Amino acid sequence: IKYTIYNSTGIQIGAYNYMEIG
């Protein structure tokens, strides 16, 4: 999986991950 993304807020790619940006 490529993508390219500039200085933006933290990303989950791939399968259905879990993540909690307080």
Curated annotation (Swiss-Prot):
Motif annotated as RIP homotypic interaction motif (RHIM), chain positions: 3-19
> Where would one find the signal peptide in this protein?
none
Q: Where in the cell is it found?
A: Cytoplasm; Cell membrane
According to its UniProt record, how is this protein modified after translation?
(Microbial infection) Proteolytically cleaved by S.flexneri OspD3 within the RIP homotypic interaction motif (RHIM), leading to its degradation and inhibition of necroptosis.
* Disease per record: Immunodeficiency 57 with autoinflammation: An autosomal recessive primary immunodeficiency characterized by lymphopenia and recurrent viral, bacterial, and fungal infections. Patients exhibit early-onset inflammatory bowel disease involving the upper and lower gastrointestinal tract, and develop progressive polyarthritis.
Q: Which family does it belong to?
A: Belongs to the protein kinase superfamily. TKL Ser/Thr protein kinase family.
Subunit architecture = Homodimer. Interacts (via RIP homotypic interaction motif) with RIPK3 (via RIP homotypic interaction motif); this interaction induces RIPK1 phosphorylation and formation of a RIPK1-RIPK3 necroptosis-inducing complex. Upon TNF-induced necrosis, the RIPK1-RIPK3 dimer further interacts with PGAM5 and MLKL; the formation of this complex leads to PGAM5 phosphorylation and increase in PGAM5 phosphatase activity. Interacts (via the death domain) with TNFRSF6 (via the death domain) and TRADD (via the death domain). Is recruited by TRADD to TNFRSF1A in a TNF-dependent process. (Microbial infection) Interacts with mumps virus protein SH; this interaction inhibits downstream NF-kappa-B pathway activation.
Q: What does this protein do?
A: Serine-threonine kinase which is a key regulator of TNF-mediated apoptosis, necroptosis and inflammatory pathways. Exhibits kinase activity-dependent functions that regulate cell death and kinase-independent scaffold functions regulating inflammatory signaling and cell survival. Has kinase-independent scaffold functions: upon binding of TNF to TNFR1, RIPK1 is recruited to the TNF-R1 signaling complex (TNF-RSC also known as complex I) where it acts as a scaffold protein promoting cell survival, in part, by activating the canonical NF-kappa-B pathway.
Record's domain comment? The RIP homotypic interaction motif (RHIM) mediates interaction with the RHIM motif of RIPK1. Both motifs form a hetero-amyloid serpentine fold, stabilized by hydrophobic packing and featuring an unusual Cys-Ser ladder of alternating Ser (from RIPK1) and Cys (from RIPK3).
**The protein, known as:** Receptor-interacting serine/threonine-protein kinase 1
